[PDB]
Amino acid sequence: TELLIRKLPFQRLVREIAQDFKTDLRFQSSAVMALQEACKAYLVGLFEDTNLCAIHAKRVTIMPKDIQLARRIRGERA
Amino acid sequence: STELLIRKLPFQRLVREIAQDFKTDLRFQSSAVMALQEACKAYLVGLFEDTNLCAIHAKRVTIMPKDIQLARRIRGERA
Amino acid sequence: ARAKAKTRSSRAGLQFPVGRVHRLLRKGNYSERVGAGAPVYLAAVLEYLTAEILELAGNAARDNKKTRIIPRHLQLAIRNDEELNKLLGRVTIAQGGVL
Amino acid sequence: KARAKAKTRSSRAGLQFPVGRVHRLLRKGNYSERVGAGAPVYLAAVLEYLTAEILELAGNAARDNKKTRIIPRHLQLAIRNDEELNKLLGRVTIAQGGVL
Amino acid sequence: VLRDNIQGITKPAIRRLARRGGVKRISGLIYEETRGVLKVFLENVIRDAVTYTEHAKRKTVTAMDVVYALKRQGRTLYGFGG
Amino acid sequence: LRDNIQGITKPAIRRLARRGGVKRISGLIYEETRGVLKVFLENVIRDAVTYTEHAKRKTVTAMDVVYALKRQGRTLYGFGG
Amino acid sequence: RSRKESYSIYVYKVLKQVHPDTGISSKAMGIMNSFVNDIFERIAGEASRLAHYNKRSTITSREIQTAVRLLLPGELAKHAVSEGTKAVTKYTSAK
Amino acid sequence: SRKESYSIYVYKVLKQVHPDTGISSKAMGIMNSFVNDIFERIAGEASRLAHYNKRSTITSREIQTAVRLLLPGELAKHAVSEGTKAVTKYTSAK
DNA sequence: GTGCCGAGGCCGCTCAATTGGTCGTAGACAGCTCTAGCACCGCTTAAACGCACGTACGCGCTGTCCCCCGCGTTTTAACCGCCAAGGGGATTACTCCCTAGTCTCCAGGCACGT
DNA sequence: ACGTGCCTGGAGACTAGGGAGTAATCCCCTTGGCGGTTAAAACGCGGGGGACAGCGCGTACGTGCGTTTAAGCGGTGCTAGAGCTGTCTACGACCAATTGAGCGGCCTCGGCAC
């Protein structure tokens, strides 16, 4: 597990979010594994865009403004 | 509605020159050229908005080819 | 003999055509069958969205001392409302001005 | 009476993918009222060609890593190391593609 | 019920994700921003998955609900079809 | 016809950039913008010509352009009739 | 002796309902037609997908409601669902 | 009940391109997802193409145009060639 | 105060929406099964965490020079109007051949066993 | 990983009908040419704003290490709910007759530009 996101905390976070949409919801294990895989892919792609924004400002340290710029150019809702 | 001139005749010649590499003896409806021009206007204005965002990030006020390249790379457009 | 014909839009209290919406749903290759309430629901939703956009655009035109809605006012209404901008953000309005 | 020996439409077209299953899927899916005779054959040929391309590049990746089997990492490498397949499958997330 | 589990994605996990994306150095203010971004993304996906589940009269979210919710974002996911 | 991308003049690019909020423009921006526009137009016109060829037509119509733009994820209102 | 259909008269009726003294240009009419058409195809396609996911052959108001929830954001979705439910209730109560 | 899948046809194509290579079950699942995704993309594009021209029938001409619209560059040329070859052989084969 | 044109109102017709009846089947509901999601517990050990510390790097400041903007002048080529030609899109009518549907048959693909 | 039974989805043959291919016609809308005349672009110049390199400082990040935390695993049990089968009834498709809604062409004069 190179990109180790731990199972139990992620499952608890997934359950917490779903409580705001429907009460007493169940989850298959494969549904949580799909959510975790999507989260990994999304975050790796966003960190790649963030690193391009940092290099463009002649930096090696990624900063929150880089993430904001990448997400704005992508068109993601702030 | 707040005029933003791209001249009709050179753009038409450009569209005909581009299209002749896909099919010879092609006709164009006039509304097709108007739609293409409107799409080009919108696309370029939005790209310059992203380019200006990229230029400010580098503490500049002058947009440069590298800003366009970064904006298009983040957008996902093919280089 | 039969009773006087009443359009389904009048029955549902709508301005949009329920019968035309049903015909388009049946023609469109969306499903084998179409329920009775589906065209009514769709017409109601379309009427609501049209009313929202025309309200905002009429407000925008009024703020310009103009009594007639033009594509610029529709563009202003779409871009000045967060919900409409999220719904209609990737859309190009002809002659609307790219801001 | 004397029915000839049945011949699959896959064998008539020289294909490995099932023409009959592709025809049934096209009919069932409410894509159109009617389906032509050659449309399932064309679709099955295209699908088989794309499958062959991807499996060839994944086998090359598996061979370059000296493994005798294809794993999802090899499919991810094959997709991302070819320009056309990256253009076709760039927006796609492969399960276990990055990590094994 | 336990809440504030977004802290469950730890700083070293974010560091690992960022190093796989090519990042060399990470500001200390990146972690909270990353947690917020992840929360927004997860909220959108889970909202559409729960809508798909509620439509089907079910009480359990399946892998196909997540796949359908992700697909209609434009984030197709392979390997959960069966 | 050969040199028509130069018909998108430097003042036109300056106007489009000003409308997008740009204050100062480098002199190397115009060739890059012309190349970007050429790529975009090539993609759109290729898909529109495919649509036209499917219909046994010789004239590209506004609906072909609207369909080509729609499948890029760029939706153009006001040319459907 | 031929026709092409549009939503112009209904959009005009709704416009007179909301802004009695305001008019609309033909260009804006075309924009409104394109908008209505686009929203119709979006909702119909989502409803068709929803019916296919559940192995159903009928598109009902439940499919339309779920599609509207999927496609429309936030308060727009909440108000559209309220309007559609109100209209369907009024329709079914009648005769 | 009985889920139909492309595993055996993908395995036949694998033994044609790499007769000594195997494939894991997870890779077969990714290949199944890929085949389904491509089938639904092409069929949807062909269905839209038929409706634009006021037609009721999806023929090989709609499939060819869908392949040319969806596949990029070199991929479209070879896919079109393979489909035309299959249709010609199928038409000749009684 | 005057002139323009485009948007609003009116009428005839014609075709698509409405009403009524019939019937086949899709789906809603009940009952059952048995699978898999959830909760608890104890133990281990991997991973996160908190602190210290050195140094790489972000950021502010300064100075030079280059190259963008604004302005005035000349050029050039878009554009509008008028005319002509002709290609080709849209419509209609006829025909024939291709696809749906039904019934019969069987062989490929999947669960079980080895 | 291979052999085997069976059972369900695919293939064969025939028929009816309507979808689509083809020919003919017309008229409209795209393409080309020519002249003038004017708006827009191209060009040159001068100045100063801004880009960029160099430098110093101090702060915050990466690394290492001992300690703490809680995740993971295996086992057990419970019980909700998903998936399947069977019945039956309401509901939507289909057809035929009726009629009013809606579309196109014409007439008018108002909101804007000059």
Numbering used by the authors:
A (entry chain A): 58 to 135
B (entry chain E): 57 to 135
C (entry chain C): 10 to 108
D (entry chain G): 9 to 108
E (entry chain B): 21 to 102
F (entry chain F): 22 to 102
G (entry chain D): 31 to 125
H (entry chain H): 32 to 125
Manuscript text:
We then determined the cryo‐EM structure of the H3E97K nucleosome with the Widom 601 DNA. We found that the entry/exit DNA regions of the H3E97K nucleosome are flexibly disordered, as compared with those of the wild‐type nucleosome. The DNA ends of the H3E97K nucleosome were rapidly degraded by MNase, as compared with the wild‐type nucleosome, indicating the enhanced accessibility. In the H3E97K nucleosome, roughly 120 base pairs of DNA were protected from MNase digestion. In contrast, in the H3E97K nucleosome structure, the sidechain εNH3 group of the H3 Lys97 residue apparently forms a hydrogen bond with the main‐chain carbonyl group of the H3 Leu60 residue. Accordingly, the backbone geometry of H3 around these residues is distorted in the H3E97K nucleosome. This structural difference changes the location of the H3 αN helix (amino acid residues 44–57), which plays an important role to capture the entry/exit DNA regions at the nucleosomal DNA ends, and may induce the DNA end flexibility in the H3E97K nucleosome. We found that the H3E97K nucleosome substantially reduced the H1 binding. In contrast, the poly‐nucleosome containing the H3E97K nucleosomes was quite defective in stimulating the PRC2 methyltransferase activity. In the H3E97K nucleosome, the RNAPII pausing at SHL(−5) and SHL(−1) positions was drastically reduced (lanes 10–14).
In eukaryotes, genomic DNA is tightly compacted by the nucleosome, in which roughly 150 base pairs (bp) of DNA are wrapped around a histone octamer composed of two each of histones H2A, H2B, H3, and H4 (Luger et al., 1997). In chromatin, genome activities, such as transcription, replication, recombination, and repair, are generally suppressed and epigenetically regulated through chromatin structure. Single amino acid substitutions of histones substantially affect the structure and stability of the nucleosome (Flaus et al., 2004; Kruger et al., 1995; Kurumizaka & Wolffe, 1997; Muthurajan et al., 2004), suggesting that these alterations may disturb proper gene regulation in chromatin (Kruger & Herskowitz, 1991; Peterson et al., 1991; Sternberg et al., 1987). In addition, the canonical H3.1 Glu97 to Lys (H3E97K) mutation has been found in cancer cells, and reportedly reduces the nucleosome stability (Arimura et al., 2018; Bagert et al., 2021).
